[model samples]
Target: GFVNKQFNYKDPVNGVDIAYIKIPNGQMQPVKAFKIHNKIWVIPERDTFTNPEEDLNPPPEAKQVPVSYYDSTYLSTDNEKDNYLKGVTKLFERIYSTDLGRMLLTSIVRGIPFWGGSTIDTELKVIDTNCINVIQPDGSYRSEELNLVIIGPSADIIQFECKSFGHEVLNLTRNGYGSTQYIRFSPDFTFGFEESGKFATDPAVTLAHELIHAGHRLYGIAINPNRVFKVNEVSFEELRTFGGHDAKFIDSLQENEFRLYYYNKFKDIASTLNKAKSIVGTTASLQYMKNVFKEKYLLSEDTSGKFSVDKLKFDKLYKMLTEIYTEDNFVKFFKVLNRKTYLNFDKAVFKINIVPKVNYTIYDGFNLRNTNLAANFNGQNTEINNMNFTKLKNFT
Candidate 1:
């Protein structure tokens, strides 16, 4: 059996009648709607409409869409908004999964100052706001190809996004128009390898490289082609004609032909050589000079005098070249040179309040030898008598 019950109340301000009805032994409560200024505000938990007559219809203007396409899409088109959100979300996920992001974050948190400060919160905000945005023709949004924002804790926040295929084009509406601190990464991945494992490395390296570019730019180290490299020589004709030629050759020719070629050209040459050496040395030893020479000059000879052992004037040059040309040796060389050179320079340069720390360690230890008499007594003696151990560790 069921019974009916009812309760009633009035709107506190407007004195509008509100009522609720319930079955026997059921809790029944009244609802009320109040006015705030000219707007009707409903206390949702306490408000109820008994019949159609008590419910007010929303105004026609309230249901109308905004004229702006972006606004309209954002408000009305869940599908469109979802797609955009998906793209950004995917980007965030990919970035977090990359080695570049890890390294950047490591640098930031370690206070290495490579990417920025150590605060993650500040870096994320900077990335969200100052990040460069690009619109693609394929109806997808793209962020800058490179970004390095220091949130806090010396970690760097980096983001990179590009089109999947050649047909996709990034249209940067604002070029170099935003904060110099924000870098934009827009790499051409059209020809990049599709294998996920291999391609995964690109994001890390490319992001870090581009972030480095941005950092250099912010530090006024970005070489303007027009000012330093001679952009006039980079015409379509030059690019087409020199396209097949090696970059080093073209660069050399440009510098020789242009009197205005900045002295920084030498720095560029040195940097290229250093990078090449680092890559080569990482995998092989310098004693394998034939392979290195072959790599540097496929059909040609090593005319740079790099392999000429006698021409090495400085001990440091010998050490650097040997370490660089030797496979898997550059890291050791870099560690040692970084320490020695910094010390030399720091000692000679102006004295500062703080001295940079060298972060490498080498271990040398000796253990007791198996004496012949003792080993003979135990019938375990061999030719070896002494034991020693050496270990090295580096941090940069």
Candidate 2:
């Protein structure tokens, strides 16, 4: 048996570390992934079809892709594991090249680095497996395995250093915020299709499903880690009304939540696309299939062949997302960190409640004691809140 065997690979062209969240396997240990177009692919499995019989279920290969991506050659039964990952990768390549696809995927899959927060679970919760159909309106009905987790003050999730790299790299001495907890994703479901070999959704669609099922617990919970601490306890109204913090802070929360909602629509997209694929197939050519893919996923179209959502459709989605963090639709995911309480930092911001809490009763004016809360919200934040407010040496 392998003892804590970790997966770590460096990108030959990009000079970035690749991280993987390991899956526990009882059979022959194999990396359930493939690298296509420099993007790593995952092998989703199902409990019903779990075993990867070598000859029957060959792994994904660059060689046998000529015949059709959805044919028995790709999803051959003889060797499920090999054929699956390689095949899925081939399918993912369909949309991975597009901007909308990449941005949406990177946000859901890798937890983009620029922002300290990510919509990805980074940590897999209740891995149900992968299987896409409803696109053909197969499942026609879809729902995620809800183990919703909020990165709140009470959350005990471990923080590990993570690079936008390969398999898994939890904690590191190099990257400062490396200790981010992201849920893991792997393929383990069946594809939903109409005919024996026809798929209304991309291969990544299933992985996308698993991601949403996995991530609903993520961004649906934590609006933004950098800003909202103890996200579980906080509400949108709490953030909007009494949040009494910088307007920028509230905007950040809203934006993060927007990103979360933005990418979490794969399920909704797949279901819609499958229906569209069925209808469009009767009139348009097979190429219309790609449009079904793009329209259901992308909000805008910057590519020639790519499709986009109408401004009306886009506006509604925008409002729905904005409403989440504002009124808070959902998971308040950030882990509340008080200067003196959580991190116990040596010289951090105020402890207990680092955020500003104003009193309607307080009457601070130009003629009164402090004068820091005038610009944004009644000048309540102009002066640091609380008696524990210590003046910075520079300010004095």
Candidate 3:
């Protein structure tokens, strides 16, 4: 029966004030600090803090990482907790070294200062085997509880949504809900390959895998902070008829989505490598698995190892991405998520209503002010308003 107590530690070197938690069990836990929207929050339940102490010289000693990184609410034993921590530490080391991993980490787990957005607190949890896989009477495995990630949003969702609509974006006072990112892993990852009948993927690789899923949600949320841009909402005909706003916006959305898809493919390759370890009794390099994956699943013909989408659809998508994701557009389109209403780009630019009210009758011979028409449809958009009457008749 331990009550968590909060305290602050001021460093002798750097003047940054560090927050810590003192559990009734006589353990002192350091709380990670983050400035989200200029409000300093003590991330006591998840993540390691950025450099808080000053004059950081040589590499710090390999001390045990904070328990905040691992959610121990469901773990039953100290051994389980210890193993979970080790797996997480290794997972961090693997992910921290890679570009895609760092991108996912910054977008999902921690909010970078430069990114100018809030972060979701991601935590790792180990659960029982039945929680992961259950064999029914039919003998088919139901993997409902398989290693996966789920996000439980908080007040931040509303704040983000408001901000996206330009009502108000940043109203900072940090004492509210921006809930944690919970990932449930099978105990097999903590135990052994044999323990789960050799079905469990390596914890570190699988953690990376689940983190990929988490990134899909959090990255979008942290970037957009309101909601996602749904490509389905805008039809191809609508995009063609509209303007560069939808062109640039949809292209950016697809490009962002494709980048995650590619990273997930890499994660799949790593998982395949781990599974191979059990069968061959020797570990395979991830690069080798990736090469094989490119040949088999991706069916890519390129030998240079550069990433290229193989499908015909991917070719077009890749082309659009390459053209739009330039340095200028990258900065412009990067956080377009947070600005859901911001990318309209022009007052003349308008989303076509799904159920259009007026018919093409306006194309007949009515003057601009004669027919009842939407503002943008009437005479605002230059392309539509000044369109050649002959072409308009043909289009109608």
Candidate 4:
């Protein structure tokens, strides 16, 4: 049913010519399979801790904090979330106005941290934060979050973790599936809770970390026709959303390094640029400036610290558009106008047309995932049956 790029069917069963992602380097061989809600979750069974003593006592970093009283330097109440995101318009704009800022924006939106870039326009929010404040889409679980929650990236197999972790905090949940669905600012920073200044900048390092996470998430969703391979007990048709753990691992590969690099770079930008460098530095092409900025602020790791292994894209325009949700094309595109509603007396008609990242129209001949049939459309979100479905059948 599946194969390498050469289209060789690796799986002898299912007889359907489909593609699915094999565990990298063939992981899960001596697997640790955990079933939640009777659905099999191939929780990646890997860990670095061989220390017997450390096994019982997770390193200080993995320490747990009580969610009830967790001082997660994030919004505490619904109204606070509302006002905080409203205030982030200024944060978003500040990032938009700089080269480093734009690099981070493209990274977060396009999910191509070191390679491709996306363009966007916004003036944005939290309520209905439907755009970001999205929770699990009638699917997914808190244990999955608990998986990464207790164990940072992959589940730590030893220590009797996931079971005990599950027992203690059954009520623990995410902000949203993906806000736990945009840039998650939750009341749930598990480790280093009492430590000060993590949220000092509110959205700076936190935003960067999630951008890195989103890049991996977007990249996972944007391509890889993987359903054909592992049609096991539970079928994750939307492979895009399936690999949150993998994405978290990918994000962690550079998160700590990037935060340190970005902090220094931000200081340099604040010191060097005099609020008009983006305009005055027109000596370089816009793309050149962006590229240079990425080099400076992002991707500044030693050879051992980098994570650039592949460069591929699938599903053309809207596929990439929705997967990455480039600013201009994303659901949040019109938010800029809504923000104005609060500031003005005039009522405005809000009409939204999603433009593609590239030229794609009905006549032009391109496919859209059979999108949102249930929500905001007809009966149920478009169900995707094929490893690769065609045109708006189940467009995410």
- State the TM-score for model 4: 0.23
lDDT of 1: 0.22
lDDT of 1 by residue, 260-333 (tens): 23223222322333334322213334334334322321112255633222222223222222111221122132
TM-score of each: 0.21, 0.25, 0.24, 0.23
How much does each candidate deviate from the true structure in C-alpha RMSD? 30.1, 24.0, 24.5, 23.1
Task: Please list the C-alpha lDDT of all candidates, in the order they appear.
Answer: 0.22, 0.27, 0.28, 0.24
* Model 4 ranges with Cα > 4 A deviation: 1-62, 65-78, 111-182, 186-202, 221-396
Q: Which residue window of length 10 is worst by lDDT in model 3?
A: 158-167
Q: What stretches of model 1 exceed 4 Å from their correct place? A: 1-82, 92-99, 105-212, 218-220, 227-396
Residue-by-residue lDDT tens digits, candidate 2, 151-225: 101011111111112123421111211112222322222212222122111223323333332222222323332
How would the candidate models be sorted by lDDT, starting from the highest? 3, 2, 4, 1
Sorted on TM-score, best first, the list reads 2, 3, 4, 1
Task: Give the per-residue lDDT digits (tens) of candidate 4, residues 1-396.
Answer: 001122211222121222111221113222122211111112221232212232222243532221111122223344433333222333344334444445545533332112111121110111121111112324321212111111112122111222111112211111011111222232111111111111011222223333333433332222222323232112222222223222222234343443344344333332332222232222335434344433423323235432221112222322332233332212132111111010112111111111221211211111233443212211111122122111111101
Candidate 3: stretches off by over 4 Å: 1-74, 97-99, 106-180, 186-199, 221-396
Best by TM-score: 2
Per-residue error (Å), model 4, residue 392: 49
RMSD in angstroms between candidate 1 and the native structure over all alpha carbons: 30.1
**How many pairs of residues collide in each model?**
27, 72, 2, 16
**lDDT (C-alpha) at residue 65 in model 1:** 18
